[PDB]
Structure formats: C-alpha cells, structure tokens
Amino acid sequence: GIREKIKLVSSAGTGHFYTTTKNKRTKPEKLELKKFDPVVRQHVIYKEAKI
Amino acid sequence: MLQPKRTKFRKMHKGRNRGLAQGTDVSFGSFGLKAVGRGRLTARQIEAARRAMTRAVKRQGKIWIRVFPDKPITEKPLAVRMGKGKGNVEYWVALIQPGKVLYEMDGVPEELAREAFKLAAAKLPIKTTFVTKTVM
Amino acid sequence: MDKKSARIRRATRARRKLQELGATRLVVHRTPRHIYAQVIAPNGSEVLVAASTVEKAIAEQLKYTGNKDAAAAVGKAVAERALEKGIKDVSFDRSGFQYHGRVQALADAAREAGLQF
Amino acid sequence: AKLHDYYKDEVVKKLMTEFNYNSVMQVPRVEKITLNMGVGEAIADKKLLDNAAADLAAISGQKPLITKARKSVAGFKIRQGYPIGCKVTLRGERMWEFFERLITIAVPRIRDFRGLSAKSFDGRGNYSMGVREQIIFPEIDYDKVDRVRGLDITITTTAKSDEEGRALLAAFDFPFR
Amino acid sequence: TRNGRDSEAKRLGVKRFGGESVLAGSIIVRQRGTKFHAGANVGCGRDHTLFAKADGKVKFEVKGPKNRKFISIEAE
RNA sequence: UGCCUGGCGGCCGUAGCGCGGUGGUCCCACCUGACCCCAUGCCGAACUCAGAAGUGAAACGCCGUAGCGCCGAUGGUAGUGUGGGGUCUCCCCAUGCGAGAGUAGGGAACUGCCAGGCAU
RNA sequence: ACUUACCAACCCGAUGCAAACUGCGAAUACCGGAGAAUGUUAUCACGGGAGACACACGGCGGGUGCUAACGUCCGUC
RNA sequence: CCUCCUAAAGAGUAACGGAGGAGCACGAAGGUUGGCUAAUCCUGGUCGGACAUCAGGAGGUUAGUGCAAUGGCAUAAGCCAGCUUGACUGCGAGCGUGACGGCGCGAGCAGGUGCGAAAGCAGGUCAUAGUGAUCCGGUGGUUCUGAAUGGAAGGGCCAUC
Numbered sequence: 001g002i003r004e005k006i007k008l009v010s011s012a013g014t015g016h017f018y019t020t021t022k023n024k025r026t027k028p029e030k031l032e033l034k035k036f037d038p039v040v041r042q043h044v045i046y047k048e049a050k051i
Numbered sequence: 052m053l054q055p056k057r058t059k060f061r062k063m064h065k066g067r068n069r070g071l072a073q074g075t076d077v078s079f080g081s082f083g084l085k086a087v088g089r090g091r092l093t094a095r096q097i098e099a100a101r102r103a104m105t106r107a108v109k110r111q112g113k114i115w116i117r118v119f120p121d122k123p124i125t126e127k128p129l130a131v132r133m134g135k136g137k138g139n140v141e142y143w144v145a146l147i148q149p150g151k152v153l154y155e156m157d158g159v160p161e162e163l164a165r166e167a168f169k170l171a172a173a174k175l176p177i178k179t180t181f182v183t184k185t186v187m
Numbered sequence: 188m189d190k191k192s193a194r195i196r197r198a199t200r201a202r203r204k205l206q207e208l209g210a211t212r213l214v215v216h217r218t219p220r221h222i223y224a225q226v227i228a229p230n231g232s233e234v235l236v237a238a239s240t241v242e243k244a245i246a247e248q249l250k251y252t253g254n255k256d257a258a259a260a261v262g263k264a265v266a267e268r269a270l271e272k273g274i275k276d277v278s279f280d281r282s283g284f285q286y287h288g289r290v291q292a293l294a295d296a297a298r299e300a301g302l303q304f
Numbered sequence: 305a306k307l308h309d310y311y312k313d314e315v316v317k318k319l320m321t322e323f324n325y326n327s328v329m330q331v332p333r334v335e336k337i338t339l340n341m342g343v344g345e346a347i348a349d350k351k352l353l354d355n356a357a358a359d360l361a362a363i364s365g366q367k368p369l370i371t372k373a374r375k376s377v378a379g380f381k382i383r384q385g386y387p388i389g390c391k392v393t394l395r396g397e398r399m400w401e402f403f404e405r406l407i408t409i410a411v412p413r414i415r416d417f418r419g420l421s422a423k424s425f426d427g428r429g430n431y432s433m434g435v436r437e438q439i440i441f442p443e444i445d446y447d448k449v450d451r452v453r454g455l456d457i458t459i460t461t462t463a464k465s466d467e468e469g470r471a472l473l474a475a476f477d478f479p480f481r
Numbered sequence: 482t483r484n485g486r487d488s489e490a491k492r493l494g495v496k497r498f499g500g501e502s503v504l505a506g507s508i509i510v511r512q513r514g515t516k517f518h519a520g521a522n523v524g525c526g527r528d529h530t531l532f533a534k535a536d537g538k539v540k541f542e543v544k545g546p547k548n549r550k551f552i553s554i555e556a557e
Numbered sequence: 558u559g560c561c562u563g564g565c566g567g568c569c570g571u572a573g574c575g576c577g578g579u580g581g582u583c584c585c586a587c588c589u590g591a592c593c594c595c596a597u598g599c600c601g602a603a604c605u606c607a608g609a610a611g612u613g614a615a616a617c618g619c620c621g622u623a624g625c626g627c628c629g630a631u632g633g634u635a636g637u638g639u640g641g642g643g644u645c646u647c648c649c650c651a652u653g654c655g656a657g658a659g660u661a662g663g664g665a666a667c668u669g670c671c672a673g674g675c676a677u
Numbered sequence: 678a679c680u681u682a683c684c685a686a687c688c689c690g691a692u693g694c695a696a697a698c699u700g701c702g703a704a705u706a707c708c709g710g711a712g713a714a715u716g717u718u719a720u721c722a723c724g725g726g727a728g729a730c731a732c733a734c735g736g737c738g739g740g741u742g743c744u745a746a747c748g749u750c751c752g753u754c
Numbered sequence: 755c756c757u758c759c760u761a762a763a764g765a766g767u768a769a770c771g772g773a774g775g776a777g778c779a780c781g782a783a784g785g786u787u788g789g790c791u792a793a794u795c796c797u798g799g800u801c802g803g804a805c806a807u808c809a810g811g812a813g814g815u816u817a818g819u820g821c822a823a824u825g826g827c828a829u830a831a832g833c834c835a836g837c838u839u840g841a842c843u844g845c846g847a848g849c850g851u852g853a854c855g856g857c858g859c860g861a862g863c864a865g866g867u868g869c870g871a872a873a874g875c876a877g878g879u880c881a882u883a884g885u886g887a888u889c890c891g892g893u894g895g896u897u898c899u900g901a902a903u904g905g906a907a908g909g910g911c912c913a914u915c
C-alpha cells in the first residue's frame with residue numbers, strides 16, 4: 001500500500017538476492033541483514049537495493 | 052407498554068413454541084392467572100389486561116406481571132414483493148406455553164381477585180385459569 | 188505472587204518440555220540453609236539417585252550448608268552416585284531458580300564429576 | 305540508620321507493651337516509604353516532568369521512575385503510555401535516612417506548621433500524606449527551583465489496623481495533631 | 482448497512498477419531514485455537530492443527546488441573 | 558514399624574475456600590547482613606550472594622468444623638430413533654434410549670518414589 | 678457543605694427469556710476395529726459410450742413470508 | 755476474500771436471510787534466553803475533580819491480543835529486557851481440502867546460522883482475511899541452446915518486476 005518492494009543483495013559478489021518490503025517513510029536507512037547465500041553456501045551480509 | 056430497553060440484535064428468527072411452561076406457580080402474590088393455552092401475548096394485550104384488573108381492584112393490593120414481551124416481530128407492508136431483506140420490527144410478543152403464570156395478585160379478597168382476573172382474561176388471545184398459592 | 192508459587196510457575200514450562208522429551212532429569216532445590224539434588228526417572232514418580240546438605244555424611248565436611256562450596260559438594264556427590272548406577276546422560280532442571288551462583292556451582296560440579304548435560 | 309536503631313531499641317519495646325503481642329514479629333514494621341509526583345501537565349511541556357524527576361532525586365538519593373499513563377482517559381486528555389508522573393520506592397538505609405530528614409528538618413519547615421493529620425490512614429494501617437511545597441526539603445535550592453511543586457508520601461507498614469499504624473508512627477514522635 | 486456476505490467453510494474438525502490407526506504425519510484435528518492440545522507423540526502446527534509424530538492409535542484423553550482435552554498416539 | 562518435615566510425581570474440587578485450633582530439636586518460612594557474584598525502566602520488594610541474633614506473627618504443613626464451593630442417587634419430568642394415530646403452528650399410543658434442574662444423601666481427599674528429624 | 682413524597686447501576690434473595698448466551702446435555706447421525714449370516718460384487722480402479730445440471734408434491738427439521746399460499750429457499754426421507 | 759448464526763451435537767449445506775470485517779501493518783509488532791501478570795470496585799493521599807500518577811485491600815483474566823468475529827491463550831499466544839536475523843537455502847515420511855487450476859498442515863534429512871550453561875527452540879507474526887491465472891514484456895544470474903563454422907541476437911532454465 002504505502003509499503004514498497006526492495007531487494008537485499010549479496011555482498012559475496014554472487015548475483016543472489018532476497019526480496020522484501022520496506023516502509024521507506026518511517027525507516028529511510030538502508031536495510032542490512034545477514035542471510036544465507038546458496039551460491040557461496042555461507043551466511044554473508046545482505047544490503048538493500050531498489051526492486 | 053412493555054418492551055426490552057435495549058437488545059443485542061434487532062430482529063429474530065420465527066422459531067417454534069413447543070413444550071410446557073417454566074414458572075407454573077404463584078411465587079410472589081396469593082392468586083394467579085395461569086395460561087391453559089399456547090400462543091403469543093403482544094405488549095398491547097398484556098397492557099390491556101393489566102389495565103382491566105387494576106381498575107377492578109380500585110388500585111388497592113399489588114400486581115405482578117410474570118411475562119415479558121422480549122420477542123421482536125417484523126412485518127412486510129402492502130405492495131411489497133417477497134425477499135429484499137427481512138421486514139421491519141413493529142411489535143413485541145412473549146411466547147406462552149401451557150402452564151405459564153401470567154399475572155399475580157395479593158392484598159385483595161379471593162372474590163375480587165377472581166373478578167379482576169375474569170376481566171383481564173377477556174383481553175387475552177389464549178385460554179386461562181385462576182390459580183391460588185400452594186404450600187410446596 | 189508469593190515466592191514459592193512464583194517459582195513453580197517459572198519452572199513449569201521447562202519441566203513440561205522435559206516430560207515431552209522423556210529425559211532423565213537432575214532436579215535441584217535450594218533453600219537459604221540447604222541445597223538438594225535428585226535424579227528422577229522420565230516417569231517423574233521415582234528417584235534413581237539423590238544427594239543433599241541434610242545428609243550427615245556431606246554436611247560434616249562443610250563450613251555452611253547454604254553456600255556455593257556446599258553446592259559444589261552436592262553437585263560432585265550426585266554425579267558420583269549417578270555414575271555408580273550407570274546414569275550418564277541427564278537434563279538439568281533449575282526448578283524456577285536462576286542458572287547462577289549456588290545452582291551453577293552444583294551443575295558445574297556434576298559436569299566435572301562426569302555427568303553429561 | 306539512626307531511626308532504624310531507635311526502632312529496634314525503643315519503638316518495638318513501646319508497641320509490645322501497648323498491644324500485648326505474643327511475638328516480636330507481630331510488631332508493626334515500616335515496610336516502605338513511597339514518594340510520588342503527579343505531574344499531569346507534562347503532556348504540554350515535556351521539560352516539566354524532567355524537573356519534577358530531578359527534584360525527587362534530590363529529596364531521596366535515588367533515580368526516580370517516570371510513571372506512564374496506565375489507560376487513556378478523555379477527561380484529562382491523556383493516551384496510554386504518556387509520561388504523566390514519577391515515583392521513588394524507599395527501603396532500608398535510604399528509607400530511614402529520609403524518614404529522619406522528614407520528621408527532624410523537612411516537616412518542621414512547613415508554612416505555619418501545627419501538626420499533620422492522624423486520620424489519613426487507609427483503613428489497614430498504611431499512612432498517606434501530601435506536601436504542598438517541595439522547598440521544605442533542604443536538599444532543594446530555592447534559587448535554582450524553576451517552579452513550586454508538591455509530592456505524595458505514603459508509609460507502607462505491616463500494621464493490621466489503623467490503631468496499630470497510628471501507634472507505630474507516634475512512637476517515632478511523628479508530628480501529629 | 483446491507484448483509485449478504487459469508488466466508489467459505491474451512492472444513493475444520495476431527496479428521497481421525499479414537500482408536501484409528503494413523504501413520505506419522507497424519508492430521509488428527511484441524512481447529513482454530515487449542516480446543517485439543519498435543520499429547521504424547523502428537524505435534525502442534527502453526528494453525529493449531531494436531532498431527533501424528535509417530536505411527537499408532539489415536540487416543541483422546543482429559544488430563545491436568547485445568548481438565549484439558551489432549552490427543553495422543555499409542556503404539557499399536 | 559510409627560509420628561513429623563522437605564523434594565518429585567500420580568489424580569485434578571468427595572481433593573477447593575472459609576472459620577477455629579496447632580507446630581519450630583530437625584526441616585520449612587520469615588529473618589540478619591550486602592562492598593562483592595548477580596539484581597532494580599526506581600527500590601537487596603523480587604532476583605542474588607554471605608550468614609544464624611530473633612520468631613513461628615505472616616506464610617506453610619497438620620488437626621477439627623458442613624457457612625460456601627464440589628460430588629450426588631432413587632422416582633418423576635423434558636427431549637428423541639423406529640412403527641402407528643389425532644382435534645396435525647401442537648400433541649398422543651407401542652417400543653427402545655432417556656436428560657437438565659431439584660430432592661435424599663456424600664464430603665474437611667486418596668496415593669507412589671526418595672531424603673531428613675524423632676521414637677520404639 | 679445540609680436535605681428531599683423523585684430516579685437509581687453494583688451486590689443479596691426470589692422469577693422468567695435467547696439463532697448469533699452455556700458453569701449442563703441427550704436421542705439420532707457420523708468415523709474407526711472385530712465377527713457371523715445374507716446379498717447374482719452390491720465395492721474399488723482403469724478404460725469405451727452417455728444422458729443430466731427447469732424438478733414436483735408429501736412427511737420431519739428450519740430460514741423467509743402472516744408457523745398465508747398448490748408461496749419461496751436449505752437439509753433429510 | 756475473512757468471521758459468527760441460519761446449519762438439524764462429524765464435514766458440507768440456500769435465499770435480494772440475520773450481523774460485521776479485508777484489499778493492510780511490523781526489521782520488530784520477527785527469533786531466542788531471562789523475567790513479569792491484567793479489568794473492575796472499595797479505602798487513604800499536594801495541586802487533582804466521576805476518571806491522570808501513588809499506597810493498601812477485594813477481585814482472579816471479566817483485561818490484553820496492531821485490526822472484524824469466533825475459537826484460543828497463565829507452561830501464557832498477554833507485557834519487558836539482553837543478544838540477534840530461522841522473515842534461512844535445498845528437500846520432505848505422511849496428511850487435510852478441492853471437479854480442476856490450486857490451497858493448506860508437516861515431523862524428519864543435508865548445508866549454513868541465532869539464542870541458551872544445557873535439555874532445547876527458531877523455515878516470520880495466537881490462528882483463521884490483507885488478493886490476481888495465462889500471455890506479452892523488463893531486470894539480474896546461468897555446466898543449457900546458438901539454422902555453414904566461431905561468436906552474437908533470440909530462446910530455455912533460476913531469481914524477480
């Protein structure tokens with residue numbers, strides 16, 4: 001609704017990315033979470049990018 | 052004219068009026084007017100009968116009304132087809148099973164209570180009987 | 188809630204999970220004056236091994252019955268008695284008390300003595 | 305520490321002989337002293353609550369707890385979770401050090417002081433009283449105080465009755481009427 | 482305002498009654514809350530569905546101080 | 558073997574609540590102290606540690622007590638599957654099932670494992 | 678602050694009412710196990726060929742309507 | 755599309771029958787470890803009142819649950835804090851529910867992770883609404899394909915709009 005789709009991209013260099021939504025008004029800072037990368041088979045840091 | 056002050060819901064399913072009455076004993080006064088029939092008493096019928104018996108005892112003694120018209124009755128007006136939602140509430144009835152003590156009285160001699168009840172009974176759509184208080 | 192009832196409430200979830208897993212549990216009880224330990228079978232109605240400071244044989248070699256040193260003694264005692272009956276794998280039940288101080292001292296002693304948890 | 309010693313050596317002695325208790329543990333004890341500042345007007349000016357907190361912290365030597373609104377009420381125009389006051393629970397040394405400072409130097413400095421009420425007991429021994437000016441406490445500086453505030457003082461006791469609760473405070477020579 | 486609406490029936494209720502032989506994984510009861518609680522060899526799903534954790538016979542029982550309903554699986 | 562107490566269960570109000578009485582050697586509790594381990598959106602209240610001057614006041618356990626909860630027949634009543642019938646909005650008969658409420662009455666739990674104190 | 682031929686929630690005792698109330702609770706029905714007798718497999722699977730998807734009245738249980746309709750809408754025979 | 759009743763004590767069951775709600779929210783309002791327990795009434799208390807905050811008693815979940823209803827919820831699913839990313843990737847015994855397309859529940863296995871001393875718990879949120887098939891096209895990745903051959907375009911496959 002007032003909530004936008006965002007992609008979390010792998011820092012491991014692999015093109016792999018997770019997909020989620022974000023309330024861009026209330027939380028303007030880029031989302032950072034450690035998630036499992038199935039290409040490097042390890043838990044790496046993921047950073048927000050535009051969908 | 053008796054009626055619930057507020058209700059959980061406006062309208063109610065028709066339902067049925069099977070079974071024998073609960074509250075078949077003179078529990079507050081000395082005499083009672085018991086229903087022998089099965090039917091509905093409208094708030095207007097209840098009031099009409101209450102007025103008749105009150106005038107009869109010349110507003111001496113004490114009267115109890117053991118029935119309450121808590122059932123909403125709907126009705127579709129003229130020139131209205133079937134369906135298009137349930138009708139509007141017009142009046143309130145009390146379901147009456149054989150045995151219900153409708154009215155109770157005390158503070159008046161038996162002969163007078165008998166007459167007052169004879170007068171009220173004529174305003175009711177169901178057959179009644181005079182009842183006296185009992186020891187158990 | 189009063190101290191006891193509040194403690195039983197705190198203990199209920201873990202005890203129900205242990206019941207569910209059908210685990211042999213090392214149940215610890217603590218009091219200002221004494222510390223107790225029981226190894227109860229999964230059914231919960233029978234004790235396999237026990238040790239405490241109310242026991243003449245243990246209290247004799249201790250300064251005060253209600254301190255961390257006494258707790259470490261009770262801990263060493265249950266594990267030794269449990270291992271003599273072949274009981275090796277257990278699950279610790281802190282019984283509403285914090286896993287700290289006396290309770291911790293008892294559990295670290297039982298772990299040292301050879302009990303597996 | 306002074307009045308706790310006075311309790312042990314002289315108050316217990318006085319109460320035991322007054323009510324004829326079978327045990328010393330029956331003797332009413334001062335359980336806790338609770339100081340409270342109902343700000344209320346903090347909803348308009350948020351800074352006002354902070355000054356009430358800094359005032360209470362000087363009176364009783366411990367960090368106050370800023371109490372929030374338990375439920376929303378239209379009458380006072382407050383929503384659930386609003387900082388609408390601050391309290392302090394006094395126990396042990398700090399309760400006694402405060403209780404002496406109250407009887408000895410604070411309560412005598414009340415404007416035209418003749419004696420506090422002895423009928424303000426909750427029916428179960430606990431005593432409730434309210435100060436109008438916070439400048440009665442010598443820990444507060446008249447030159448630095450932004451506004452004149454008041455607070456609630458409640459002495460929670462182990463007394464079962466008001467008769468018992470009265471006797472426990474009177475034995476500390478609490479300035480009554 | 483106007484009525485006329487209702488949702489699809491969710492087909493909840495008891496799927497396997499007392500005594501029925503079930504293989505591990507079989508749903509015993511689909512429910513909204515925990516009308517029945519998971520007992521021995523019975524798991525509880527995210528939508529409070531009770532399922533078999535082991536092959537055996539479905540057993541219904543009333544246990545505890547709160548007199549609650551429990552579904553368990555007895556070995557056959 | 559008996560009495561008392563603590564722990565962990567079975568059972569889940571015939572087991573609970575109230576009222577009266579009662580217990581501290583041991584156990585349990587309150588309790589004493591708090592710098593520290595650890596703790597408080599404040600507070601050693603709680604959590605926690607180091608203890609033993611005091612008390613069974615509270616709590617807790619035990620004993621008593623039908624004010625309340627709770628359990629609860631028998632008989633009748635209500636309903637109802639099948640077959641039949643009437644004056645068919647509602648009933649009745651044959652047969653099988655048979656409540657709920659109320660009544661008499663019951664009732665101040667019962668029980669297992671381990672440990673500790675005391676006594677013979 | 679004092680007081681009144683008024684009204685009066687809660688609480689206690691007494692008396693009823695409920696599709697969207699339940700500290701109770703059937704008869705039936707339904708699911709599962711075992712067993713006999715009976716029944717031209719009545720059962721299940723796969724494959725060939727369909728028709729049919731305007732129903733009606735009567736009984737029982739209901740909604741709607743006026744417990745109006747040879748009314749209307751479900752269930753079940 | 756979701757919830758309750760009608761609905762005849764398994765499921766299902768109609769009407770322009772009776773009542774309401776959804777077309778979102780949340781990086782914490784998710785995970786875990788540790789802790790905590792409401793509503794309402796009576797009594798007392800500076801300003802302060804029927805109702806703000808404080809204390810005691812009764813009460814015992816009637817409160818609360820981001821939102822409708824119903825079922826749940828104290829071992830809390832309710833409320834707080836510390837650390838955190840399991841709002842994991844591949845799979846999946848066995849089930850439920852559908853004419854179908856589908857939709858749902860799921861222990862367990864592998865890799866990797868968070869929390870906890872540990873047993874363990876975590877594949878989002880108490881549960882049940884919060885939604886859009888296919889085609890065509892866009893973006894990123896790719897041991898695939900690549901119309902003489904090597905490339906390339908385009909196509910496929912995985913992710914996503």
Ligand SMILES: [Mg+2]
């Ligand atoms: Mg202490």
Ligand SMILES: [Mg+2]
């Ligand atoms: Mg006592």
Ligand SMILES: [Mg+2]
């Ligand atoms: Mg019988």
Ligand SMILES: [Mg+2]
Binds near residue numbers: 656
């Ligand atoms: Mg029965």
Ligand SMILES: [Mg+2]
């Ligand atoms: Mg009965």
Ligand SMILES: [Mg+2]
């Ligand atoms: Mg009864």
Ligand SMILES: [Mg+2]
């Ligand atoms: Mg008796």
Ligand SMILES: [Mg+2]
């Ligand atoms: Mg012994």
Ligand SMILES: [Mg+2]
């Ligand atoms: Mg076929």
Ligand SMILES: [Mg+2]
Binds near residue numbers: 730
């Ligand atoms: Mg058609």
Ligand SMILES: [Mg+2]
């Ligand atoms: Mg048709």
Ligand SMILES: [Mg+2]
């Ligand atoms: Mg038809």
Ligand SMILES: [Mg+2]
């Ligand atoms: Mg017709």
Ligand SMILES: [Mg+2]
């Ligand atoms: Mg059904």
Ligand SMILES: [Mg+2]
Binds near residue numbers: 762
């Ligand atoms: Mg049915």
Ligand SMILES: [Mg+2]
């Ligand atoms: Mg939540």
